[PDB]
Amino acid sequence: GYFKIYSKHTPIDLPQGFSALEPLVDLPIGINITRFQTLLAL
Amino acid sequence: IIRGWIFGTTLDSKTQSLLIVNNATNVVIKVCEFQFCNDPFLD
Amino acid sequence: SNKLDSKVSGNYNYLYRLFRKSNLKPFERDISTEIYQAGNKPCNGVAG
Numbered sequence: 001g002y003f004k005i006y007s008k009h010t011p012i013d014l015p016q017g018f019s020a021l022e023p024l025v026d027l028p029i030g031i032n033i034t035r036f037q038t039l040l041a042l
Numbered sequence: 043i044i045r046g047w048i049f050g051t052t053l054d055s056k057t058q059s060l061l062i063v064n065n066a067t068n069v070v071i072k073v074c075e076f077q078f079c080n081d082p083f084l085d
Numbered sequence: 086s087n088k089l090d091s092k093v094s095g096n097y098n099y100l101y102r103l104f105r106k107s108n109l110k111p112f113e114r115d116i117s118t119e120i121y122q123a124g125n126k127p128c129n130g131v132a133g
Contacts, residue, residue: 001112027071030113032110034050036047037053038044039046039048040045040083041043
């Protein structure tokens, strides 16, 4: 029932390297999620 | 350009769909039964 | 809750579900108001 969010912002295809993603938010939702979509700014 | 994401099972008012965005002001999170549009975006 | 929840004609304020599609995953909720497929023929909006 959690929604963990891990984030990492790195100054810069995918680069060849290593970067650990620090946890950001533990979001207490407790619902079913099976599909998603992103949003853009036009 | 990428401002946020939409999560859910049916993405309508029947179920509760997760909504995460980040506008020019601050990050807001809502957990509601949004009736999402077919082609949602920001302008 | 007999003192607080008891109506002589039947306390209908609380509702309970019987015919679910399948066993739900723990810690999830369904708000569907559609007629359950209680057989072989599709319901197609027909109840009874």
